[PDB]
Amino acid sequence: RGSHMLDKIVIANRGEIALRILRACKELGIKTVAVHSSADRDLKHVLLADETVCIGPAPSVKSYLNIPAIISAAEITGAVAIHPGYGFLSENANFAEQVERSGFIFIGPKAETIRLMGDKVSAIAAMKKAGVPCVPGSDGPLGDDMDKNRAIAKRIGYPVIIKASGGMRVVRGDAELAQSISMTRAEAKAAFNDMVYMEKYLENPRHVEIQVLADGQGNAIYLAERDCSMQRRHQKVVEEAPAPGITPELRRYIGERCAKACVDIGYRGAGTFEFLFENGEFYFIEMNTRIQVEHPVTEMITGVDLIKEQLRIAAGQPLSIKQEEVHVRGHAVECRINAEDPNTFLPSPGKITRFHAPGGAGVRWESHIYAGYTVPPYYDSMIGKLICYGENRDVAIARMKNALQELIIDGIKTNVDLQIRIMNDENFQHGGTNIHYLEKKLGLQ
Template sequence: MFDTVLVANRGEIAVRVIRTLRSLGIRSVAVYSDADADARHVREADEAVRIGPPPASESYLSVERLLDAAARTNAQAVHPGYGFLAENAEFARACEDAGLTFIGPPADAIALMGDKIRAKETVQAAGVPVVPGGRDPELARAAHDLGAPVLIKPSAGGGGKGMRLVRDLTALEEEIAAARREARASFGDDTLLVERWIDSPRHIEIQVLADGHGNVVHLGERECSLQRRHQKLIEEAPSVLLDEDTRASMGAAAVEAARSCGYRGAGTVEFIVPGGDPSSYHFMEMNTRLQVEHPVTELVTGIDLVEWQLRVAAGERLPFTQADITLTGHAVEARLCAETVSVKEGSRGFLPSGGTVLALQEPDGDGVRTDSGLTEGTEVSSLYDPMLAKIIAYGPDRATALRRLRAALARTVTLGVPTNAGFLRRLLAHPAVTAGELDTGLVEREMDGLVESEVPPEIYAAAGALRQKALAAPASPGWADPFARPDGWRLGGEAAWTVHPVRVPGHDPVEVRVRGTEILVDGAPVAPARLTAVAGEWLARDGDAWHVQDHDPVAASLSGAAHAGADALTAPMPGTVTVVKVSVGDQVTAGQSLLVVEAMKMEHVIAAPHTGVVTQLDVQPGTTVSMDQVLAVVDPSEDGVAEESHDAIPTSGEEASQR
């Protein structure tokens, strides 16, 4: 076994790997960019090495700097985690050339399965069923031969990046261009393939484990059908869809897929499954790394997958056969991401967020596990992936696991950084989810009922009560002049109402009046909410959080966005402008794509709010923008103004789909 292992990753996965290294008595080495100098994974490792400035291309994606860090710390092996270089064959080869053990599959297996086109051809030759489709350079012809709807996807990479569901083939050319752009930016390879879209699909994957002595087993399946923007939100093991025969058949197919590429270590074979006919499953791709959702498999099998990655890489044989693998109980995982969820026209969907973690409460308790990279004070920016933590619940049955996970999400607090915790809790309570009636389109169909589009009045009431309490508190200990109190106190009579104008970003300001225990919100009596946590201007309740600010109407009237009014296009999240399609003076039509903003590996189209002329353009490709920053102004034409929309209009790729 190794003495020292370098973890070539960051955040929660680095913390997760370090935990197992510590349990095995192996010295851990963390790496960090300047943006992560005080990150949790840096603190928890035995040693940490700076590898460069914040951009991933100059730090976490720099093979040279990672190898130098390994050499400087006398590491014998490198664990790539997931993301970044985890599925990069050249990195695996570079590690081997440097005398380091790459804790993952052979470089040739990574290269083969990393090319979705070659992967499909390889597993098909091994007898594994695949989704019908086509590839470059005949992509458009293949799409027309298949007929709409079709799924465009990059041949390289994963995580749903660059994927586009095309329901109208007249938009095919634009969608192909967008997919190529995102694939090139994410993976450095813009080769695409097209697949037939399967209606109401379920996404089920099989965990495999292979040693270097020819032994391959599968550890059962994970249901990953609850997705947004082609990326998973909730995963569980086992799937309620599969019976024992289908589970055995899919498991055997996954083992054959692993054997076909000479696999070694932990990996995942992903299938698309028609909900009405689970036996008609098709291979989609193989992820040649540890998966985000590996904890649910660990909980139902009792096998530490990181430990066996290390043992296999060190040359050990698997001590168990397929007959020894059993699934006990049920586990469900939720991905906690830095993002805001909106159902408003023009900003519908999941938009990356950021900020500083001001208050942190992570759930634990019976049957609850949290894998996290957070600490109070953590700065969450748009530089890296939006996933912050994973919250996992285990129980003897599915209903218990779901109940425990909903309760855990209600106790989750990350004040200062908007997250999807409240959304996830409501999703897990949806009748279709509790019944196990899942498909990859469910989240998009049910969005309106899963998002609190308005701030509850009791939250405004709680904000007013907190402000009133602060006013009543003496500025210093000792005697205080009662006539100097600003909280409505009056001599010999009933207290006056104290007015607190408050605002939550993205919503109109609200007037809160407080007198004693009475609170009026926009004139109506409201009892304040019982809060989970408070930090500065941030309030939390049951997984949801609100940034409740004092509203200054004078300052608001002087802001750039207020001056631009309904004609302004503002940034829906902090990020970088990657594409500008117009110039000042251009005539545009309502809904026309004008700019593209990218944040946390997600691309968002900014569209014209109405027909008119571009009179202001404040950005160019490469410009870094903050939340709500004015990007451009479109003055309405004399022909009339279409329905207004100020933020990002999701691309067709936002639609939940097969991966």
Template sequence: MFDTVLVANRGEIAVRVIRTLRALGVRSVAVFSDADADARHVREADTAVRIGPAPATESYLSVERILQAAERSGAQAVHPGYGFLAENAGFARACAEAGLVFIGPPADAIALMGDKIRAKETVRAAGVPVVPGGRDPDLAEAARELGAPVLLKPSAGGGGKGMRLVRDLGVLDDEIAAARREARASFGDDTLLVERWIDRPRHIEIQVLADAHGNVVHLGERECSLQRRHQKIIEEAPSVLLDEGTRAAMGEAAVQAARSCGYVGAGTVEFIVPGGDPSQYYFMEMNTRLQVEHPVTELVTGLDLVEWQLRVAAGEKLPYGQGDIRLTGHAVEARICAEDPARGFLPSGGTVLRLREPQGDGVRTDSGLSEGTEVGSLYDPMLSKVIAYGPDRATALRRLRAALAETVTLGVPTNAGFLRRLLAHPAVVAGDMDTGLVEREAAGLVPDEVPEEVYEAAVAVRLDALRPRQEGWTDPFSVPSGWRLGGEPRPVAFPLRVPGLDPVTRTARGTHTVTADRVDVTLDGVRHTFDRAGDWLGRDGDAWQVRDHDPVAASLDRAAHAGADSLTAPMPGTVTVVKVAVGDEVTAGQSLLVVEAMKMEHVVSAPHAGTVAELDVTPGTTVAMDQVLAVITPHEESEEAAR
């Protein structure tokens, strides 16, 4: 076994790998950018090395700086985690040339499976069924031959980045251009492929483990059909879709796929499966790394996959064969992401003001967070994972819902409450899922208004802040009682605003108890308990930022921009494209700017025909959520149409 291992990643996966290194008595080395100088993975490692400024291209994606850090720290091996350089064949080769062991598959296997077209050709020759498709340079032609709907995918990477489902071939060129930009930003390579889209598919993947002595086993499957924007958000093992015969057949196909590329280490073979006929499965791709969802496989097999990555990389043989692998119980994982369901799941950010992550009987949290963590727009939005295990699926689901209700991440909007409601959806409970289920049902799983008790709690906090704290005599005029000379008491009113919603004015109607970190309110005979931190209130995985609203300032702002519409940043991020200049005439719906955050693009369009009166950003400008980007003065006919 190695003495020292460098973890070439950040966030929850770096913390996860460090945990196993510590258990094995192996010294861990963390790397960090300037943005992560005080990050949890840096604090938990035995030593840490700065590798550059915040942008990933100048730090976590810099092969040269990673290798320099390994040399300086005395590391013998490098664990790439997932994302960044994990599936970069050049990085694997560079590690070998530097005398380092790359804890992953051989570079040639990474290169082969990283090229999704070559991968398909290789596994097809090994007898594994594949999805029909095509690739660059004949991408558009292949898409039109396949016919809509088709799926555009980056050839160089996975994780849903850059994937585009095209149902209207009339917008194919625009979708290809957008997919290329996202692929280039995520993987440094804008090569694309296209596949036939299978309606209402299920996403089933098989975990494989191979050593350098010719032994390959599979560790069962994971169901990953619950996705948004082609990104997995809930995963479970095993899948309720497969019977023992289909499980064995798919497992053997995955083993053959791994053998076909000379695979060594832990990897995942992904299949797309028609929900109506699981025996008709198709190879999609092979992820030549550890997967985000590996904990569910660990829990049902009892194996530590990171440990076995290390042991295989150190030259050990697998001590078990396929017949020794047993799947026991059921495990389900939920990915906690920095995104705001109430704002269309746009990426979010901020400072973690209060954090509570569930642990306990049948519950595990893998996280890179701590209180004070700054969540910015430079890296992936996933913050943590909550995983539940039980003797059966119903128990695992129930435990995970309860764990998500206990999850508190105040200061950064997350999807925890949304995931809790999703896991209670009848189709999910019944196991009747497909990759489009979340998109179809999302609107019904996002509350369309703020519960009244949230405003009541916000009022309670403000009333408590106004109460005098000194001992002894109290000036009665300093007490917020609503008392008036010669009249009935009038309750104190507070103008409040939740970002993205219209302001409201509320007075206290119930009873309250306020402490430093909690608010209890009883409204209409029902008691509600909230976690609190600053302007934030949280309950059952949901969170709201309730700010004070200044109606005078808002009125002055409206007057300053009378007759014009301000276009604001929908999320914290970076402006990557500016298509107009001050004085340009624009049409309704015209694309004006592109804002990128957490590897996701958002197009800002003109709300109506008009003239660009102000333009406050250029490509490369970092913007905060709701920051003004441009001001459009409408044409007279647009104003008349609006009236």
């Protein structure tokens, strides 16, 4: 035992993220244990792992969410750590608590941190305390004294939105504040209760998120930001880094705030701070206490291997990277490739009859698919991620177009066509479109 302390690791996940993790492991000489459902015996990473363990039938609830089977998998193989990747049990405290209780290292933050940020009220509370900008509001249920309510809205700045404590109405001026509150009162009465609170209405915001790394020993750094505004039905479709328009100084401002937050909450490992960004102001929404799907975009513009850092941190090693050594270079754009139905956006199962991946400079392909592989119906629609890097934003986009053209995936329905359309969208090329843009372009409004 000694190529890395975490000499053998259980990859509690599937698809592209599991492969991504497997590779990071092989690089470090770490033995891999791929737990899988009976429907994923043909996953690329499973076929490449040192050991494979079936943890149950196709259904996620019976496999990838099966806590005892996953820990038993770690036990029978003498594994020492478990990487939950993203989704599934990655932000499930109970799982982390049992994993560690069984004597294994959970590659993620402390159980108490998952719970903290996992709760919206506790999270906001902690973020404000640490100095992270949050969504302005009445700080509690609104009374009937329209005078302070008008002052609250004023202080927060219109437009404001009235929300029911148990579930909403937009107010653009104090002239309609009173009526609006009463109107909202009624509905909720019904609708739900009578209590109502006020929040700042962020009408046309962008989705900007800050990547961080903390060793849980007092060291925390931020690795630039990512703009993940290209959304359809709240699902991310395109991601890029850095975020267009964000200056080095603003980046430094929001970055140091998140790093400080990590220190205050004793955060450990990789995490992400998602904010709504409008009129140059950041507003914290939530923090994902895990690795991000779109992490590659950050990896390519900073030259940092986020998965490997997660492993080193989980191995008790303090951060070896100082904030001043972190330099953003170039631009990276990510298109998510999904095997999805164009009318429901749901997974579109089937056999891939022909597959050809794009190649060339600045082209990264994260995917488990291969000619002959069949997309199962039990999980998500994501079959891969295509990330293109360039010395600047225009080069990255130009490369994504070229790469999307070389990409061949027959036998199943995909969104490749959609991606090409987005890369050719004049507004996207200009940069900085808000979270409502995509649904507009395609009329899902």
